[PDB]
Symmetry: C2
Subunit: 142 residues, 2 copies
Amino acid sequence: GMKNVTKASIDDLDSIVHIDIDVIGNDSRRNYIKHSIDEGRCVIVKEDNSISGFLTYDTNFFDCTFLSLIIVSPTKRRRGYASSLLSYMLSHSPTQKIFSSTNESNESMQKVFNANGFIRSGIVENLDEGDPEIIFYTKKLR
Amino acid sequence: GMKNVTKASIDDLDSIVHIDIDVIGNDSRRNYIKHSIDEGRCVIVKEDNSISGFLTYDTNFFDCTFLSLIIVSPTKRRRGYASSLLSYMLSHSPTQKIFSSTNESNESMQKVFNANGFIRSGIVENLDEGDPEIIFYTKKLR
């Protein structure tokens, strides 16, 4: 179906958290996500009248935007939902610099960052055991 | 003189910012520091009835404590003030994991991290031009 990306509202929270329960196993990130929506920091991608994925961000990573969750429903069967979320941020980031990360084991997300013009931009060790966070970087559309 | 380290109160803000004006050139971090004190996230080291240095932290670095400012007055002429601040955090961090960073060019701060049992733990590029942030890591006292 036709995708569209937009800023989430509080009406979207229960659908968003239902996605997150599929991805992480529980509703433990509900309050983080709720706070993000309260602050206008949550973006959704929709298709066929339902939410297909979501993104949260904050501006507290060395004073730059960091994309803290980039989540697609495990029901989806084609690529492009994460890309839609990222492209929205290229236009709507409150800072010129945009960072995010994923595990070194997560070759799927690495390929999404690549598909969206993000580059490797560092590493944070001593987080998940044996599986560091790889930092990704890009600049906004200008 | 005898040093002591303790949680800052709002009474300490004008002295703290006076240090920061020496270090960065202006009072641009006053609101950050003020907010830190408001939230109980600022530590001071004192000697001879005056504040000699300060530290701020937050718990929003991959859900871990990050020491966001570690600042010593440029008037001081012996080592140990930053160490005092770090040792307080080893006992008072709200998380078992403790991170911080400094520029790759900052060999003085690197030596402070070393003197306090922090290890290199990654890098973030595309911040200061040609001078990445080196991530440092340790665990709390237990």
